[PDB]
Amino acid sequence: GSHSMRYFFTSVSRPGRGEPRFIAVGYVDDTQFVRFDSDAASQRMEPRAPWIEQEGPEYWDQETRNVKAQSQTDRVDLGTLRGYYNQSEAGSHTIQIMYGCDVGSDGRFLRGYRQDAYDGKDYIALNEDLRSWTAADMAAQITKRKWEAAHEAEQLRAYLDGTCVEWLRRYLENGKETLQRTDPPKTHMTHHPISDHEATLRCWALGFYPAEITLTWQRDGEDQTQDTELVETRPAGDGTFQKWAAVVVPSGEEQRYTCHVQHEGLPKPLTLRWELS
Amino acid sequence: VVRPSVASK
Amino acid sequence: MIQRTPKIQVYSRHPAENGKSNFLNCYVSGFHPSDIEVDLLKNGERIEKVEHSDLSFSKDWSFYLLYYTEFTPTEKDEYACRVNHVTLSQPKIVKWDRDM
Questions:
Q1: Number of A:C CB contacts under 8 A?
Q2: Which structural domain range is residue A220 located in?
Q3: CA torsion sign, A183 to A188 to A194 to A197?
Q4: On chain A, which terminus has fewer CB atoms closer than 10 Å, C or N?
Q5: Would you call A94 and C34 a contact, using CB atoms and an 8 Å cutoff?
Q6: What is the C-alpha separation between A112 and A125, in angstroms, rounded?
Q7: What Rg do the C-alpha atoms of chain B give, in angstroms?
């Protein structure tokens, strides 16, 4: 199937109390493989997956230099964006950057992307074509003008549809023992009376590796998307994910409710029903 | 691998 | 600016089995800004050696973190996650419940 390589950066200004906290994380699909934390002991890019550890000292030296350089741009940009948005020097602000690429099962380039945020809102994003930018407001347009002039998109594209794709293909080959795995969801249903007259039917999906999943509740075919408590997909902590969906049903009417489980690692969408006596 | 270059905002 | 309050989930890696070693998880998500304090508690007391994932974020830019520790679930042992964020009036405590 399809794979991705993504880098995530967060820089948080610490007004007066030193330089900003920078955290960088690299992922292949949903598996973290590198990290850098400005507050950590090493002051270097560190391995986080066994299949990346086999990389040489020139690899870790380069990654360290290049991640620190990103950290320094972010430091400048925090002051620049405080200027653009007309904010005081007293408050703490955040810059978030996400960039990366997708490749198909043949390893062919599918998409490249870059999105930036300031204080948890869109700031600027590279468009799907990898040639143009979309600024979220008029201050962000100033960045766009500067990048359009500097031909930043061509420089970024060279990485997103070239450098990124080359190394993603390498990482997928180096981690072929673990990254090509897909674990399908282990499904089940639970029942919890909330009184003498009603009960919670809870539909579970555990140990699934493509974090993407769909859990829906239907009362006699008709969707119950308004009376469903859906929890955010969460990590089990061993690379697999978990999710549950719940509905409060009148006692004796449990058989009227169905839980539909759509996942990619599943041949056909699983249907679950409370097996009454 | 992370980007080697980065243009400022 | 807009601040977003954390969503807190306390759960175990594998389904709970009395006497059987497992992992106690506290997943905090959808919060902004990133400054957060998370403690895992055993009978109201802070578990000393708890690890966490590296700060990351979702498509909507909101942050997420996983706090975890190896634990053996006993019948009389009470486990909880205690979270403090700028959006909270007082630290929030979410008790561990096997059923969810």
A1: 76
A2: 186-273
A3: positive
A4: C
A5: yes
A6: 11
A7: 7
